[PDB]
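[job 0412] stage=fold_complex status=start
inputs:
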Amino acid sequence: DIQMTQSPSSLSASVGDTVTITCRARHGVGENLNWYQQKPGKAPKVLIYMASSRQSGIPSRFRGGGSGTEFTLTISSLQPEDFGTYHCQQSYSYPWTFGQGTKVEIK
Amino acid sequence: EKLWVTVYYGVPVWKDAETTLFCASDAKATEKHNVWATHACVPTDPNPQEVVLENVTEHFNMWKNNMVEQMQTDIISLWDQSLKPCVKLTPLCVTLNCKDVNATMERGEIKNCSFNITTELRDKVQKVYALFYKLDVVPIDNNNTSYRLISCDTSVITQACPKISFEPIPIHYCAPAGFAILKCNDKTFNGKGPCKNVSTVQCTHGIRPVVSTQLLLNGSLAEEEVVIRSDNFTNNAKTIIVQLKESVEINCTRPNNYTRKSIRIGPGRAFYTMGEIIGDIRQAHCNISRAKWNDTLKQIVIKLREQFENKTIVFNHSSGGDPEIVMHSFNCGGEFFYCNSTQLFNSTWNNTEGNTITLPCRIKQIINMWQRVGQAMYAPPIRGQIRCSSNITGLLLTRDENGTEIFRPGGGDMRDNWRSELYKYKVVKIEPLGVAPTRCKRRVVRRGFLGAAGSTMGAASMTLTVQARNLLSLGVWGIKQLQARVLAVERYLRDQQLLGIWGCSGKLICTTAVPWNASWSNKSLDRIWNNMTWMEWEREIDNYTSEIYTLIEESQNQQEKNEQELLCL
Ligand SMILES: *[C@@H]1O[C@H](CO)[C@@H](O[C@@H]2O[C@H](CO)[C@@H](O[C@@H]3O[C@H](CO)[C@@H](O)[C@H](O[C@H]4O[C@H](CO)[C@@H](O)[C@H](O)[C@@H]4O[C@H]4O[C@H](CO)[C@@H](O)[C@H](O)[C@@H]4O)[C@@H]3O)[C@H](O)[C@H]2NC(C)=O)[C@H](O)[C@H]1NC(C)=O
Ligand SMILES: *[C@@H]1O[C@H](CO)[C@@H](O[C@@H]2O[C@H](CO)[C@@H](O)[C@H](O)[C@H]2NC(C)=O)[C@H](O)[C@H]1NC(C)=O
Ligand SMILES: *[C@@H]1O[C@H](CO)[C@@H](O)[C@H](O)[C@H]1NC(C)=O
Ligand SMILES: *[C@@H]1O[C@H](CO)[C@@H](O)[C@H](O)[C@H]1NC(C)=O
Ligand SMILES: *[C@@H]1O[C@H](CO)[C@@H](O)[C@H](O)[C@H]1NC(C)=O
Ligand SMILES: *[C@@H]1O[C@H](CO)[C@@H](O)[C@H](O)[C@H]1NC(C)=O
Ligand SMILES: *[C@@H]1O[C@H](CO)[C@@H](O)[C@H](O)[C@H]1NC(C)=O
Ligand SMILES: *[C@@H]1O[C@H](CO)[C@@H](O)[C@H](O)[C@H]1NC(C)=O
Ligand SMILES: *[C@@H]1O[C@H](CO)[C@@H](O)[C@H](O)[C@H]1NC(C)=O
Ligand SMILES: *[C@@H]1O[C@H](CO)[C@@H](O)[C@H](O)[C@H]1NC(C)=O
Ligand SMILES: *[C@@H]1O[C@H](CO)[C@@H](O)[C@H](O)[C@H]1NC(C)=O
Ligand SMILES: *[C@@H]1O[C@H](CO)[C@@H](O)[C@H](O)[C@H]1NC(C)=O
Ligand SMILES: *[C@@H]1O[C@H](CO)[C@@H](O)[C@H](O)[C@H]1NC(C)=O
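[job 0412] stage=fold_complex status=done
writing structure:
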């Protein structure tokens, strides 16, 4: 099983700034890393598909990229609606493991 | 009394030309996987420039405008590029066992078809079922329940990738450096002939690549009145493009919800089709306000009467035939609607109930779009209630005998939709070099780009810098961008080479040693410099230009360079 980590484990920022969450793999996965947004008490929804491909309905404020083992999610012009826990998942090889998640508090 | 040839660089002279144009878009409009690939276009400038050309009258002809053919080529190439990396439905051409789905309710419009699919991935025949629209399935074996998918026998059906969006995004056309686009600003311009208010732009306004027939949607409206345009106009076999003064709001809908299922075709590939119907079954329809359409026809009839003399005008429905060409059509919401439109062309005007006209509409998935044979697209189900609320801004009419003219909704190819937006634009080629007589021998207020074009040669001659400071500086748009840059480079170097040989590489005004020959133009300098514009002069000198150039290089730079070579001693 490919082990996943994420950094920072706890993040906070004010409305309108730009933040970065980095998801790290023990082994390379090409571009096959998905990003999800989980609201407290709700199931997550996917934000980014193959590392950089954004899901329709998600505003352009959510950007991402990277390859190999180090990937980033960049959230520009942070909004109150962006409060929640972000997760990253590898689709390259089975099991499709997840990182521990990053909690984003909005101030 | 002796006049000498002098070379000018930056002459506001243009000639008609056909060139490759490149695209631009509003980078802050901006979804990817859009069929129009607008993310590959150069971002537009917030400042559009727009220089009004005083004293310039230009001849515009919408029916021979290369920009329309170029746009059609780009639109078709973009569709083929977008659809290419998608699932082919070749394995899906199988015998369908179809029964009517029982239920303004529909009466047999949706069929429940069960068929068995042979799949490569495993030797496996699976009995699957799917829902299809009546227009998607062609009956076979007489009265048997056997059907096939429409156009399978004539084309290879390509499934559109569900991630592909069909939303129109305005596309700006921009001339390569060294070329310019002239825009006609006449309020009642009829599409042909002279235009008085002509402005120069680098890029056109945004054009929404809306694909429709009979009625023009979105786009742009006329400013003063309804304008009816044609080519010969006498010839009944010519499309009449009607641009409206005020838009008509048309609200089309597909009230059914449905669900979507995926039937695997092969590894990594599946057929996306309609599943169980959620909710009741209601006919798709479109609501257009009656009073607004009534006034729209009143204005159209007035203009048609003015151009066709005081004859009776009657609007009829289009002749029966293939729904793709005899019905109004559009791709609103990602689904493809075909609407009857008869209620809009069913009245005699010569010289009463219901606030809204409801047009029945039918949904089709297998589309032989662009009037081609051998290709077809399958649009996956959207699974949603499509509220459209689009603007009608123009009509395409055709003409067919007791003193009455009969008009039908219709048109030719999709080009008619784009002329409506490109009618005011012309692409021209700038040739910044020219020659003129002056009194000087070598003896070894600003308006913007081409703003002096309508001025006399004098007064215009002090703005040559304005043009000199201009000119220069893997999909469809990438290649066209590459061709545009290479063309601009080639033209800049041709001009620089000509200036280099003459002996004028560093000057906007360059004096030569070649005397002026009275046979070229037997006119005094005041008759030339204070009467003619640079374009009239260039046309007048167009028969002797190669002679002047031959004399200037031969006698001025291959002899100056030999006389100087001898004088050093
Ligand atoms: C002429 O102009 C009129 C007036 O503008 C045009 O009308 C607009 O039409 C568009 C196209 O439908 C419409 O935009 C939709 O608005 C919906 C409002 O509820 C949105 O829900 C919808 O978003 C979905 O589709 C988008 C395009 O695919 C996606 O970017 C977006 O993320 C959403 O995607 C969801 O749904 C799709 C379904 O296909 C699915 O694939 C995805 O997974 C996801 O579930 C659109 O933004 C505008 O609202 C209309 N404007 C008005 C004022 O009504 C009209 O279309 C033009 N005429 C023609 C002929 O094109
Ligand atoms: C269309 O036909 C399919 C058959 O392929 C229908 O499927 C049956 O539906 C009933 C209940 O409606 C179930 O009890 C059966 O088990 C289904 N059989 C299958 C899937 O083989 C389907 O209901 C019909 N759908 C519509 C929209 O009419
Ligand atoms: C294929 O389907 C038809 C009805 O559509 C059925 O009569 C036939 O038996 C099926 N054959 C196989 C091999 O599944
Ligand atoms: C002429 O064209 C310019 C283009 O900028 C426009 O602003 C102006 O109103 C037009 N005038 C007339 C009389 O058409
Ligand atoms: C449609 O017409 C309305 C009329 O009020 C206008 O506000 C709207 O911007 C128009 N939409 C388009 C896409 O042209
Ligand atoms: C216009 O159409 C008429 C049809 O009567 C034809 O005689 C005429 O030659 C046409 N003229 C042009 C310029 O197309
Ligand atoms: C489709 O779903 C909507 C959800 O609001 C519902 O109102 C509508 O009636 C449904 N359509 C039909 C035809 O039942
Ligand atoms: C269209 O008009 C009819 C009139 O009965 C109405 O019932 C229907 O809801 C309208 N449809 C839309 C999409 O507004
Ligand atoms: C279309 O729907 C809009 C919804 O805001 C409504 O205002 C408008 O009157 C409708 N037009 C027609 C022609 O029914
Ligand atoms: C529309 O014009 C026709 C012309 O014959 C007239 O009979 C009809 O009553 C008018 N309808 C409205 C709603 O103005
Ligand atoms: C055309 O319009 C006339 C108007 O009198 C009508 O009688 C006729 O049925 C319409 N349709 C055709 C196909 O002629
Ligand atoms: C439009 O509806 C009328 C209703 O009488 C029908 O006769 C006509 O054939 C329909 N047109 C098309 C193109 O289906
Ligand atoms: C066309 O107008 C006539 C006028 O008598 C009317 O009877 C007929 O129903 C109209 N056509 C449609 C499709 O409603």
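[job 0412] summary: Chain B has eleven helices and 35 strands.
[job 0412] exit 0
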